[PDB]
Design a binder for this molecule. Sequence first.
Ligand SMILES: Nc1nc2c(ncn2[C@@H]2O[C@H](COP(=O)(O)OP(=O)(O)OP(=O)(O)O)[C@@H](O)[C@H]2O)c(=O)[nH]1
Ligand SMILES: [Mg+2]
Length: 660
Amino acid sequence: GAMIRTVALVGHAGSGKTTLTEALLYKTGAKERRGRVEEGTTTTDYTPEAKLHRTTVRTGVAPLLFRGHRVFLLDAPGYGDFVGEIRGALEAADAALVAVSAEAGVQVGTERAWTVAERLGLPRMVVVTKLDKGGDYYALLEDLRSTLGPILPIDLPLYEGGKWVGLIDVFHGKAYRYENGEEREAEVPPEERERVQRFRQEVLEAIVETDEGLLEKYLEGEEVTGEALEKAFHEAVRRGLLYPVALASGEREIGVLPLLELILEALPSPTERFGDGPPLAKVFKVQVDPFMGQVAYLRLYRGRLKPGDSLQSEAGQVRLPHLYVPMGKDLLEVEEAEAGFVLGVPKAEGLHRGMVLWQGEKPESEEVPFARLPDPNVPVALHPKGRTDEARLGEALRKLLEEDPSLKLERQEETGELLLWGHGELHLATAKERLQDYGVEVEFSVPKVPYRETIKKVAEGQGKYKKQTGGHGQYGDVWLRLEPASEYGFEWRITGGVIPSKYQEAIEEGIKEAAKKGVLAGFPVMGFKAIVYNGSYHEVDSSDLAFQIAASLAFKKVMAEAHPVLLEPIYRLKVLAPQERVGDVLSDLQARRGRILGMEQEGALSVVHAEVPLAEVLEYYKALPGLTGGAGAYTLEFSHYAEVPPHLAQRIVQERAQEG
Ligand SMILES: Nc1nc2c(ncn2[C@@H]2O[C@H](COP(=O)(O)OP(=O)(O)OP(=O)(O)O)[C@@H](O)[C@H]2O)c(=O)[nH]1
Ligand SMILES: [Mg+2]
């Protein structure tokens, strides 16, 4: 009676998620006509980026109304590039509907969605799409069984002359065919009956075994009622003990409403997950429309709300004079909201992704669903195209990051460049396009490498600053010795009190400042001991400034005779390529001045450890997926610095010097 469900539709790119979402919206009456991704007419993919790349860049909300029941379906993206939106959609749902292309089977995007859902403690259901494009359903079920585990087949495909035309409801022993956008009951083909009965028995047994009460009856001799089985089934799915497997296609228009009925029957309600109590909500995503402003998307996990109500938040009281349910980019006004509802809050400049909202006692960390986002690992130096852009780029980035916090903006300490980190070439491309939607043109470039300097031999020298400008003068005198070393260190070796200990901080600051720009090529210096072993001061003219200057003057003089050497960053790779996709990964590193460190070949997938310079893998994200059959992801992490091979070393030194 007036049930509610919040479900995240996830899965690998191209598994027919958005097409299924369109079919659901159309078949329920929420939409006049079902659009197509190819034509850019769907409810989910409305932003310029989504339509341009023909992929779900942003999670779309599809509020489904069916016979009084409500299913708030979140149509999430498929590519790992949009992990931010994917993980947020799962954080917002009480269960995951995982689409699996029949012709491809479980893919990388399937495993990632599945794992995040499992960690969030969410029930899982699988929907098999694209059976009309090919694939063997029965072999697919076996693969899902061996890969996912306790799957539970709900549907089997109905075939007519080799053509997929419908489905067979295993449990009820009924078949349905579709044609002209119409569902009709059909007979279970004679040749299929024995197999269908086998699946039915296995389904009955799988459900009975998860319920102690039913296992007692089945054993005691008592009868198992249909209502008893339904309850056991629902509870088993709620606890993640069974994973229903449905068959549906928005393109072929097969099993669409049946999938909705199954969602209501199999997946849990907000109450079965959080129980009843005061309002509890969370902003799981944010959209910043170029014209409409910021809109916050909230998931109400518990409680009820009416227009005029308010919620507490870390940012203070949040009034909601108007309640809106989102449907794509549109906000539909409602007169009330119950747990399970997904709401859209306009003019939400003060609400950000991750903020918890509540009434009553403030929730503690464990009471709210949370899925951490991996740090973005693809950097690109950012540059406004021109004048106006450079000026509007500040506000444009603010909006971009509010809407997509999976993107990180940083200022390289050494290089000084403004870097934007994303999760892939595609993610960054959408970021670029989005900035353009905000009226700003930018261009990317490979980040400048943060080269460093060091010394190879010991050297000593004096640094002295003595001048008199005005009333009093300044005096600083320092003797410095530089020693090559693995780690930087300041060593105060002053004796006889020739320099008071109070100038130690100033002297070190001077050494550090000068070290910001080496003598060899103007890069930061590292790996050296700075030893202050003698000097002098004047009680009258000595000061921190004088010694900082004296110390700096000494560093530059001394480093010039310590045999400078140019260093470069060196990272370690941890590639993950399939069985025969290893002879292509270890073949690529050779052109990148690499070095193998190990290879964990276990079963099918075998890890491939390595070590390679940073200057050689700045755009290795534009290659790995195209060599590991796309079923592999590269990993780059800082290891240590090293001397730039004499060849390049000289080359690089020349450039930096050439101009300034
Ligand atoms: N033959 C066939 N094609 C389908 C089916 N479902 C979707 N397609 C098509 O396959 C493509 C996948 O479409 P979407 O529905 O955009 O897929 P998605 O899984 O939502 O894709 P992403 O948002 O990129 O993760 C589209 O070009 C659809 O026209 C299906 O059941 N059968
Ligand atoms: Mg999609």
